[PDB]
Design a protein around this ligand. Structure first.
Ligand SMILES: [K+]
Ligand SMILES: [K+]
Ligand SMILES: [K+]
Lengths: 97, 97, 97, 97
């Protein structure tokens, strides 16, 4: 269908944004007076922390550019997780019979 | 349509609430014994942090008034991000054919 | 209708849970070696922080009982905010004509 | 039905993931230079903190393995709480009459 397939594709897109966001956030933050967004294996963990919108506080950006990257990974999580709710909402609606 | 257009307009409304919230939160908090909601370029970052409901902890209000502003930017995020889920949910429902 | 009215009633219910949760969390936490869930005007702010699931970190429970109260205010927020998304999702679906 | 029953079953599944996640996160983290994911009664509280995506910051994983467990309990919360929104969205749609 569409609903069932657009969602599955959005999760493939979310992984893209995480890896790209992690690796972009490092080069944005690394040379500044700021938190450990200075190694990749920590930026990956930050992405997941942020895209889920759990936001522990153990890591975050302090650069203007690094904070842009943030917004992107934030909405990428919210939106793509919204699709998966939407997909299930029509699967449940697709039982009106 | 409506669903597709009401959502796009809600995101234009969310930007309004962020800028207005940021600039209102500063004047509420600036003269108090509290966290760096004392400059604008930091209040903008707080808005995004809060409207996403990521809530890192690096910034927040300690004034009663500054904490009102918070609630507003909080629900503004939740609600308007809900509309975008709703918009996609009917776009997926709009394929019953 | 129902969708439009059940939601409006759920938000009246959320306010109930906040005030009841705030005032229950204080008496649970006040006498323990733990964070400022020891005054009411701070427990109210914690409720909003938690029901939104923003979770700044400036406040939280450290008692087993105070942590139960938490769960309640957590899901009360998630669920009732879900209804408002659901309400809008059928209002958008209610334009199939 | 399905929508009303699949959701109720997902919440039974969420409890499973919490207890399994809590008890798996402890053995992953206990022997490392990291935060109090070193006792069970604290890992249970972390699960709820994370599955709700409140993320206070008082607790989190610092191990690669402990951070995997995290992702699992994160999406488990997002997804299963999505179903409950979806369930209510079709219950409201199931009044088109
Ligand atoms: K959240
Ligand atoms: K959060
Ligand atoms: K936090």
């Amino acid at each position: 269908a569409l609903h069932w397939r657009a969602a599955g594709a959005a999760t493939v897109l979310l992984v893209i944004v995480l890896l790209a966001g992690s690796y972009l956030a490092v080069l944005a933050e690394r040379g500044a007076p700021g938190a450990q967004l200075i190694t990749y294996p920590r930026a990956l963990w930050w992405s997941v922390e942020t895209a889920t919108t759990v936001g522990y506080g153990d890591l975050y950006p302090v650069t203007l550019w690094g904070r842009c990257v943030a917004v992107v990974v934030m909405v990428a999580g919210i939106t793509s997780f919204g699709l998966v709710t939407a997909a299930l909402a029509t699967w449940f609606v697709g039982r009106e019979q």
